[PDB]
Design a protein around this ligand. Sequence first.
Ligand SMILES: Nc1nc2c(ncn2[C@@H]2O[C@H](COP(=O)(O)OP(=O)(O)NP(=O)(O)O)[C@@H](O)[C@H]2O)c(=O)[nH]1
Ligand SMILES: [Cl-]
Ligand SMILES: [Mg+2]
Length: 288
Amino acid sequence: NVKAMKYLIEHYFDNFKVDSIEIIGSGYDSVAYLVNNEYIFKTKFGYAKEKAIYNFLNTNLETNVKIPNIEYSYISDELSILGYKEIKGTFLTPEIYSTMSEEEQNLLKRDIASFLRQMHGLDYTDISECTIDNKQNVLEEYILLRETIYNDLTDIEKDYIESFMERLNATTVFEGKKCLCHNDFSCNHLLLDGNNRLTGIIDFGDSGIIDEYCDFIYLLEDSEEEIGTNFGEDILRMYGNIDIEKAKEYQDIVEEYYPIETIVYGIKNIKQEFIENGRKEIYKRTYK
Ligand SMILES: Nc1nc2c(ncn2[C@@H]2O[C@H](COP(=O)(O)OP(=O)(O)NP(=O)(O)O)[C@@H](O)[C@H]2O)c(=O)[nH]1
Ligand SMILES: [Cl-]
Ligand SMILES: [Mg+2]
């Protein structure tokens, strides 16, 4: 993989020489590479929006928090590559957080809240095409379910989905303030400097104009990978002027949707393994 990608980087970016290249991360349909111990290259076989977002934010944010600044891009239907200088630091984790003093933890939370406040406050007219309607997306995904596999699902599966749609239809949490959100704001995207302060934020690949509540979904998550509900709550108090009970209702609805989202990903990409994982996850959730 590394040789192919070294070839493509050198072929598409004329004067660029690859002296070293390793895989630094990978998703289910992308790979990220650290090149020359100094550049991140994110690749995929979309990136246009992500690039337009980095470029919008590097123009308009006033902050000492670093974000990707795109120096190299190649965008086509069949291949997309974004390259930028690696932001240096350590990724925030539960382990690191629990070793911080009370005052270190407070300052980190203040940093986060301040970043979010600043980004959510931007005039988003120049990026106004990047709208995301989560409720409408879910309805369209449900229609796709009904057109494909819904009738072969079990009753326990069908009840879970219907019960979710009844809840979606009763909620008011999509009727609030819209703004530009990171939209994948988990602690594996936050970088700390040597004083445990926020030095950088990565992966605005899902960013767009969407509910303000979106950027608290992971901050409020209780799981091995995130810090915890209390972290999110304190950040919400520092951020201010936001209904904390609704932020939590929004997180709770998104977490309920997860197995259905997983099924849908499998339908859209013809990956049976994902249809099966989501269906199984419905059974796991039902038997708590
Ligand atoms: N230190 C550092 N690591 C980075 C940087 N950019 C990317 N990475 C590393 O590369 C990984 C993948 O980058 P990312 O943008 O999150 O990839 P993705 O394709 O959007 N995947 P996902 O949405 O699943 O997080 C990150 O988890 C991190 O390990 C950067 O600026 N600095
Ligand atoms: Cl299946
Ligand atoms: Mg991403």
